[PDB]
mmCIF file of C-alpha atoms and ligand atoms in Angstrom:
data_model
loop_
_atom_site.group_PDB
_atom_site.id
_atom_site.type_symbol
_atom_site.label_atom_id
_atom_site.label_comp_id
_atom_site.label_asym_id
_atom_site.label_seq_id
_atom_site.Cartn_x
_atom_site.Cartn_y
_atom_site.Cartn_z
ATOM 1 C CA UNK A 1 0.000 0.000 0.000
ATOM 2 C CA UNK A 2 0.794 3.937 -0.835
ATOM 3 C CA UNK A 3 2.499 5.651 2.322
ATOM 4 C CA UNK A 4 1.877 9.451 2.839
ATOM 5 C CA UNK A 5 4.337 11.366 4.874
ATOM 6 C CA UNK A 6 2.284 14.529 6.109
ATOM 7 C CA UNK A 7 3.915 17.529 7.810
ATOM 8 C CA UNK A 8 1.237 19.089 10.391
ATOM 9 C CA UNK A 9 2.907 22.839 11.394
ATOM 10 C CA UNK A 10 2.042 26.087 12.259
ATOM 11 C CA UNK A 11 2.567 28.859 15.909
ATOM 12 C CA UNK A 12 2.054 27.567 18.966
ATOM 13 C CA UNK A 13 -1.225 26.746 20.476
ATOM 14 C CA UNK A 14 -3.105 26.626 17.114
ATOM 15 C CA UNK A 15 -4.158 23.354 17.255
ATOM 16 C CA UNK A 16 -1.854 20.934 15.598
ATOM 17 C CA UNK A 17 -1.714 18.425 18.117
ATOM 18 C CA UNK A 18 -5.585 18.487 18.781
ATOM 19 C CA UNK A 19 -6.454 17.996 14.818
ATOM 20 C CA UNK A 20 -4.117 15.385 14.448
ATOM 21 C CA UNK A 21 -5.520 13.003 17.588
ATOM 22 C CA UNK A 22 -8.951 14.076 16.136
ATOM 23 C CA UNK A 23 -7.980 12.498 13.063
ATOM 24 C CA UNK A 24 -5.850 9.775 14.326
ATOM 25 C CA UNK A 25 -7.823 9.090 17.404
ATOM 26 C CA UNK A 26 -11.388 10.337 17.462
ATOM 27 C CA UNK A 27 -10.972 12.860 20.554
ATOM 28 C CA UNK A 28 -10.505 15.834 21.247
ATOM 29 C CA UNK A 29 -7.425 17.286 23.692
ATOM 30 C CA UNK A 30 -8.716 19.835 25.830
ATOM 31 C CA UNK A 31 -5.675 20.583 27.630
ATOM 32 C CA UNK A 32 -2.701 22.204 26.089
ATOM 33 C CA UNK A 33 0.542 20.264 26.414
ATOM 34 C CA UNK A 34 3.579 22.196 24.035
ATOM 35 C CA UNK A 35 4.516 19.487 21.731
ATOM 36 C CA UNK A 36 8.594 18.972 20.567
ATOM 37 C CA UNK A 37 7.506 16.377 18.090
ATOM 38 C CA UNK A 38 5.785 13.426 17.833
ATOM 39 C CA UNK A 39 4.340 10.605 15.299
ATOM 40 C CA UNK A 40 1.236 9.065 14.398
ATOM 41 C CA UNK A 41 0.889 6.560 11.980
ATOM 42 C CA UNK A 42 -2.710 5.027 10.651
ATOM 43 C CA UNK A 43 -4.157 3.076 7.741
ATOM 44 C CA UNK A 44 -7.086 4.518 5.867
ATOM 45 C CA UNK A 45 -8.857 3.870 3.035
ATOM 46 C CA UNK A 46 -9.236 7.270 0.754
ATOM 47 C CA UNK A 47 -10.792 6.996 -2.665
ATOM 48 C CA UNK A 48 -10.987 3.363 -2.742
ATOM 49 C CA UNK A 49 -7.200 3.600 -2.270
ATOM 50 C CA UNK A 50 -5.776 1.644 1.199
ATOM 51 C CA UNK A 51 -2.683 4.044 2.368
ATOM 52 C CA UNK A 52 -0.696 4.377 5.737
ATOM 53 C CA UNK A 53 -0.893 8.115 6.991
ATOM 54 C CA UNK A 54 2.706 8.936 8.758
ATOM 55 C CA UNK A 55 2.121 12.392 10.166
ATOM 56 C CA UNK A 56 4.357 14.523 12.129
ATOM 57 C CA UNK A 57 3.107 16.592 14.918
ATOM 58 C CA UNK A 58 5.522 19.615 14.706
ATOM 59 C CA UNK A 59 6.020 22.087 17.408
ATOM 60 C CA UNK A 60 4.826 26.053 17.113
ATOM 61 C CA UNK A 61 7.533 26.636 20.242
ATOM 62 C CA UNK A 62 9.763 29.279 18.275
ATOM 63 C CA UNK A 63 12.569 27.633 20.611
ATOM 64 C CA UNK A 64 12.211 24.765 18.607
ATOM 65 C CA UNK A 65 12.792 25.948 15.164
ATOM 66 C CA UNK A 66 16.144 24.669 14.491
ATOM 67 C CA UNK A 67 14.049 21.048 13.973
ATOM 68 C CA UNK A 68 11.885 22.587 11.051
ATOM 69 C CA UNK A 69 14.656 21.978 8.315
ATOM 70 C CA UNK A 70 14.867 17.914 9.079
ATOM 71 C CA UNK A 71 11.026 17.285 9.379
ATOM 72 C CA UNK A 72 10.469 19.791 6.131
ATOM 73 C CA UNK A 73 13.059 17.588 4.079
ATOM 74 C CA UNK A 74 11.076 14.371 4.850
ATOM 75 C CA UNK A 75 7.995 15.590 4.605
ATOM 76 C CA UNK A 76 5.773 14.987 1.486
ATOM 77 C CA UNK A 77 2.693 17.441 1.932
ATOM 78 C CA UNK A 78 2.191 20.132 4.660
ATOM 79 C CA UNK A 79 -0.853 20.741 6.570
ATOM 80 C CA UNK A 80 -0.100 24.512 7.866
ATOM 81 C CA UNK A 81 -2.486 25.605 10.806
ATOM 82 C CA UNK A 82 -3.202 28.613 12.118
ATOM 83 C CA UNK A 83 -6.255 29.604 14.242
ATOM 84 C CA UNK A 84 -9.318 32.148 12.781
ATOM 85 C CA UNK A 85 -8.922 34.090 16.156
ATOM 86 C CA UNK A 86 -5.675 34.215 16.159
ATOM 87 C CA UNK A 87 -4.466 37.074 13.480
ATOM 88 C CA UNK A 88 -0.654 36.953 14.351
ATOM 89 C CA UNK A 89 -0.602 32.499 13.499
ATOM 90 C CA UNK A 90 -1.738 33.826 10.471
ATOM 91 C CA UNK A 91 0.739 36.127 9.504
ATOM 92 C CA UNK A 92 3.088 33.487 10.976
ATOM 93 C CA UNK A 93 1.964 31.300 7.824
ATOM 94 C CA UNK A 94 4.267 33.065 5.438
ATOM 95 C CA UNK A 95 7.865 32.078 7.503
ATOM 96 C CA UNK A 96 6.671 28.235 7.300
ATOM 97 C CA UNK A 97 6.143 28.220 3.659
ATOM 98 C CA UNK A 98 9.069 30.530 2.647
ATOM 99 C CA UNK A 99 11.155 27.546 5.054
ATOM 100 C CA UNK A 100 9.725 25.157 3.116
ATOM 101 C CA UNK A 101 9.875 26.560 0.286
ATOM 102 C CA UNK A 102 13.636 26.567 0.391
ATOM 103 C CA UNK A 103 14.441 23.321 1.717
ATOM 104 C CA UNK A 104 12.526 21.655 -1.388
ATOM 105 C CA UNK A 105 13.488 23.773 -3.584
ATOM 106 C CA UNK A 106 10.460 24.412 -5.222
ATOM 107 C CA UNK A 107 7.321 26.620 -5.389
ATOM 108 C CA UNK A 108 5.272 23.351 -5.664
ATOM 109 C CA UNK A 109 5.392 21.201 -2.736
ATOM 110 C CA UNK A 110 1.903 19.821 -1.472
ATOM 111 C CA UNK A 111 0.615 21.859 0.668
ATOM 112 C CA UNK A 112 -3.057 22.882 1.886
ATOM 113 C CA UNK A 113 -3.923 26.173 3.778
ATOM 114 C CA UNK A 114 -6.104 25.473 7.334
ATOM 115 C CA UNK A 115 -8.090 27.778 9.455
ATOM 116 C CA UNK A 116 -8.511 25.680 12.496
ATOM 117 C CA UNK A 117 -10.864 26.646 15.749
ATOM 118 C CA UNK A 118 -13.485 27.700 13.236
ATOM 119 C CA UNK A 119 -15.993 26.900 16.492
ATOM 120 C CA UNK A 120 -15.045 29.810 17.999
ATOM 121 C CA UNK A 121 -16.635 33.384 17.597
ATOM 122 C CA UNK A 122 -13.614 35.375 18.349
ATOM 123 C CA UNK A 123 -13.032 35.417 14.411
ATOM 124 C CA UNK A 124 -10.136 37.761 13.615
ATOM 125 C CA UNK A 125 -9.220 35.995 10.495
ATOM 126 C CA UNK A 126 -12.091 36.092 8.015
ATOM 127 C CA UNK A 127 -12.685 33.561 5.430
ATOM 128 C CA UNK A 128 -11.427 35.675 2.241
ATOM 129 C CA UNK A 129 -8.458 36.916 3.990
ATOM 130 C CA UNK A 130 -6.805 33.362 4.314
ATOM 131 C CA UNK A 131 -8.841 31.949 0.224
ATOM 132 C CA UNK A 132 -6.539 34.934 -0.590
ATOM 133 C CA UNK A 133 -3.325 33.683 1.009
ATOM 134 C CA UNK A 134 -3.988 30.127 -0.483
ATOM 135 C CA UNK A 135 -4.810 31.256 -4.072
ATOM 136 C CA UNK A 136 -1.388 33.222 -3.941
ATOM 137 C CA UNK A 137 0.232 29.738 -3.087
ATOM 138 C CA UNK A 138 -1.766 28.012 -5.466
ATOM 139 C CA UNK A 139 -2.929 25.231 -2.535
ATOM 140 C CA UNK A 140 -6.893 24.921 -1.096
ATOM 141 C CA UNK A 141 -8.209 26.627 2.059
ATOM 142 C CA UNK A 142 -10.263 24.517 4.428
ATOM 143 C CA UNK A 143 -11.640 25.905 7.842
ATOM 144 C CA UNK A 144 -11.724 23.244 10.689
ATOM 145 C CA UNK A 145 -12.717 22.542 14.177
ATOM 146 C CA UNK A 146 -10.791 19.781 16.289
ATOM 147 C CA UNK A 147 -12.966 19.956 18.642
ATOM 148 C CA UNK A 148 -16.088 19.288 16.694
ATOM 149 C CA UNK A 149 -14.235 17.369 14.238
ATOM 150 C CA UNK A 150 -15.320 19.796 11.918
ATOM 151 C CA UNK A 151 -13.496 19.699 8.218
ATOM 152 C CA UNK A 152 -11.030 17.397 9.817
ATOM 153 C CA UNK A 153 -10.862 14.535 7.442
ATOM 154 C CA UNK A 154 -11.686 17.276 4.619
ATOM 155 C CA UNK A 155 -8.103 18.790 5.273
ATOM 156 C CA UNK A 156 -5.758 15.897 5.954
ATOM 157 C CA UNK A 157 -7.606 13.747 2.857
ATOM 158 C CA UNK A 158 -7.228 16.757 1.160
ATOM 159 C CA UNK A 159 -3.746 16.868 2.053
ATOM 160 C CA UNK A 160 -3.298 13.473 0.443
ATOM 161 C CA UNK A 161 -5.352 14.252 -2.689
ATOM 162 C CA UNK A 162 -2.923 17.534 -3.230
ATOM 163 C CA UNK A 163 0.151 14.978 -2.999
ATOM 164 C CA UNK A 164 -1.547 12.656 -5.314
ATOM 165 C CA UNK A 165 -1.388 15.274 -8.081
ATOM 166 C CA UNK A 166 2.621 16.063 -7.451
HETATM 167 N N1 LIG B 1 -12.172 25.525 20.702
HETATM 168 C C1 LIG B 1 -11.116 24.933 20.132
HETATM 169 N N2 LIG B 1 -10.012 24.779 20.845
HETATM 170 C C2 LIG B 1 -9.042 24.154 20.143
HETATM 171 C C3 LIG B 1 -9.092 23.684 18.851
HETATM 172 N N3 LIG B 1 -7.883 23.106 18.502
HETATM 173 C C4 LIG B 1 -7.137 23.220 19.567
HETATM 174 N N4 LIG B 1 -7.783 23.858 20.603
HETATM 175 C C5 LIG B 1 -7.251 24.125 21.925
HETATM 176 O O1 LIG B 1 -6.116 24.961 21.795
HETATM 177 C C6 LIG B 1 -5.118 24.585 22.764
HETATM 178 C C7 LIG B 1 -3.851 24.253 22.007
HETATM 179 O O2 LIG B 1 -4.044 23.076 21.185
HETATM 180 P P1 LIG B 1 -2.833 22.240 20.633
HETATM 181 O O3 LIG B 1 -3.423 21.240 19.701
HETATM 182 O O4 LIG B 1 -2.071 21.715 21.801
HETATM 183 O O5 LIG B 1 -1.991 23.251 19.821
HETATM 184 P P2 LIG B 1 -0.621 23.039 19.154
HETATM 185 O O6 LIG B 1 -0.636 23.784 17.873
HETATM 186 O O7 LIG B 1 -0.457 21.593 18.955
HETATM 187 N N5 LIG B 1 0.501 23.592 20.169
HETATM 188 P P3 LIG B 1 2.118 23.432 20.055
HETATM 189 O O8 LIG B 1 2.598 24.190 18.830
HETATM 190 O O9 LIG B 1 2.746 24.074 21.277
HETATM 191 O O10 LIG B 1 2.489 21.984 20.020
HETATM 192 C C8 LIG B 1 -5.720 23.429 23.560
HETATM 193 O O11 LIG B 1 -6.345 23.898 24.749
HETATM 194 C C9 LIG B 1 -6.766 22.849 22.603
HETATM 195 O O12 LIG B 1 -7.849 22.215 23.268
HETATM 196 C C10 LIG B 1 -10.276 23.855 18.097
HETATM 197 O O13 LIG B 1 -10.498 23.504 16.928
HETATM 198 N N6 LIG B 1 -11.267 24.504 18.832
HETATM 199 CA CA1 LIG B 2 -10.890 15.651 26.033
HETATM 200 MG MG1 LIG B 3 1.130 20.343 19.613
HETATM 201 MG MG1 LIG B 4 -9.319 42.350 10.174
HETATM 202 MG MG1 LIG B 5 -4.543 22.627 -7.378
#
């Protein structure tokens, strides 16, 4: 079977962690616990196709940047987060895709745009701000919710679907 090596990243406290147990494990983390990095690893069936998921649960921690270059050189498609009430995640977006950006040395690497916490009123990133952002990389926008599982699937399948046309 196809293996997918998926990339979650994005500022701390965005949600990473908490869409990627949603995903992986049906639940949703309440409590917030800084992640350095950590691996989850689950087979799925996605259009009719049987594949193992290997995703990487990076960590927004600035103090942990120096790890970005190694898990963005293994990496085969990038989920990258931020949170629609959280305006500076968002303009933290651009530094993750410039990095990878570099390291593969390309303008096309798979990549899809997510505005996560999309249960939350405190909206400070509007929809068309971030469609905007994603157009300009060329890569789809999805709004989710790990906490009501909300779009969840729809991102990381869609994730897989952008890699699938690499
Ligand atoms: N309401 C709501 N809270 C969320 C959502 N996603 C995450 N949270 C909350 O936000 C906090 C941080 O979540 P977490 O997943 O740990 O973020 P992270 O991006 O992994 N953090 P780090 O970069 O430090 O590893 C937690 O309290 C978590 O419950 C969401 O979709 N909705
Ligand atoms: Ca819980
Ligand atoms: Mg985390
Ligand atoms: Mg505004
Ligand atoms: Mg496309």
């Amino acid at each position: 079977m196809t293996e997918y090596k998926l990339v979650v990243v994005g500022a701390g406290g965005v949600g990473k962690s908490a869409l990627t147990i949603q995903l992986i494990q049906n639940h949703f983390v309440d409590e917030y616990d800084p992640t350095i990095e950590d691996s989850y690893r689950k087979q799925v069936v996605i259009d009719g196709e049987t594949c193992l998921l290997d995703i990487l649960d990076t960590a927004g921690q600035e103090e942990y940047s120096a790890m970005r270059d190694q898990y963005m050189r293994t990496g085969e498609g990038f989920l990258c987060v931020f949170a629609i009430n959280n305006t500076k995640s968002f303009e933290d977006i651009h530094q993750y895709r410039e990095q990878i950006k570099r390291v593969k040395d390309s303008d096309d690497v798979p990549m899809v745009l997510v505005g996560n916490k999309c249960d939350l009123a405190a909206r400070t990133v509007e929809s068309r701000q971030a469609q905007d952002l994603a157009r300009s990389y060329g890569i789809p926008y999805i709004e989710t919710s790990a906490k009501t599982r909300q779009g969840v699937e729809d991102a990381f399948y869609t994730l897989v679907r952008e890699i699938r046309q690499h």
